[PDB]
């Protein structure tokens, strides 16, 4: 059946608005971008040492506008880059992360060290602080710091990133009604990776995984109006195609900009196969939408995997 209208529905239910139009998101991540200020001042001053200084931009989903509201019990995720004036050969990145660690010692629960950021958790929502150096004072690149407390040499350096260079790519990729539906189906996949796969570990695709593979591959479908099932369709079909035959199969995407990482490299070869079978999963439910005669068919088939916010219709 023809499912546009349930789309555009399901669209609404699941859109949460960008950084410029979201008071209560600019609020939620200046209160930590505060606390960061105010911490870097005590933890500093009790040194004897000049507190560091920072530059805030905004980073993710809600600075692309590819925002979605997590399901009951879940958590968002505010999505802030610190550019510490500093020079990158002048600190160890995991000692600077230890900055950011201890000025939040008193906010909320506190903060954790993880490989790219320093996240504060709050009441459902969390706040990943990824912490770059200063271009100028770093030879003229933007570096973030890597490498976890107690990590081996290997294991931590300051790499060179361009999350400004993706939001562009991103942005620029289309505009007007076709960014739109980039930008919906976007948000589709976010669902149906809250409602399929576990927060647990690597198991889920991540977020910008799939705003990389839709960079790669999303086309825009329209006609007699956009057609969102079909652009989901051929978008997954595109994926699947893209799987190859290593130790098992595997979707190996690049970050279209520095560092040009595999951004689903974190996932098993387990969770690469079941991702595929999902994947396989959610096609077929697709293909289903478009050949039930009943709407009220097509919308559960739909359903099943966009969770219980995809309405479907009676009779």
């Known amino acids: 059946a023809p499912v546009q209208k349930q789309f555009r529905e399901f669209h609404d ?8 139009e979201n008071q209560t998101l600019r609020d939620e991540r200046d209160a930590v971008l505060t606390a960061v200020r105010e911490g870097l001042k005590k933890v500093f001053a009790d040194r004897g040492e000049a507190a560091p200084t920072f530059t805030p931009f905004n980073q993710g989903s809600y600075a692309m506008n590819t925002g979605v509201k997590p399901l009951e019990g879940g958590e968002y995720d505010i999505d802030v880059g610190i550019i510490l004036n500093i020079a990158k050969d002048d600190h160890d990145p995991v000692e600077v992360k230890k900055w950011i660690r201890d000025a939040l010692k008193d906010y909320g629960n506190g903060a954790e060290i993880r490989r790219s950021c320093v996240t504060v958790f709050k009441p459902g929502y969390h706040v990943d602080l990824a912490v770059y150096a200063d271009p100028e004072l770093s030879g003229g690149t933007l570096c973030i710091a890597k490498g976890k407390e107690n990590s081996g040499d290997e294991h931590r350096l300051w790499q060179i990133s361009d999350p400004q260079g993706f939001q562009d790519r991103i942005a620029s990729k289309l505009s007007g ?8 189906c976007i948000r589709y996949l976010k669902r149906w990776r809250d409602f399929r796969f576990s927060s647990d570990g690597n198991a889920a695709p991540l977020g910008i995984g799939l705003t990389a593979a839709a960079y790669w591959w999303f086309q825009v479908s329209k006609g007699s109006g956009y057609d969102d099932r079909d652009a989901l369709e051929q978008f997954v079909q595109t994926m699947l195609d893209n799987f190859h035959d290593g130790s098992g199969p595997r979707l190996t995407v690049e970050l279209p900009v520095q560092p040009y990482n595999d951004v689903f490299e974190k996932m098993t070869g387990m969770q690469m196969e079941s991702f595929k079978s999902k994947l396989q999963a959610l096609l077929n439910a697709l293909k289903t939408a478009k050949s039930r005669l009943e709407l009220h068919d097509a919308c559960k088939a739909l359903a099943d995997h966009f969770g219980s916010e995809f309405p479907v219709p009676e009779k």
């Open 13 to 20: 239910r699941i859109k949460l608005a960008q950084y410029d």
């Open 177 to 184: 009604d076709d960014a739109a539906q980039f930008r919906r």
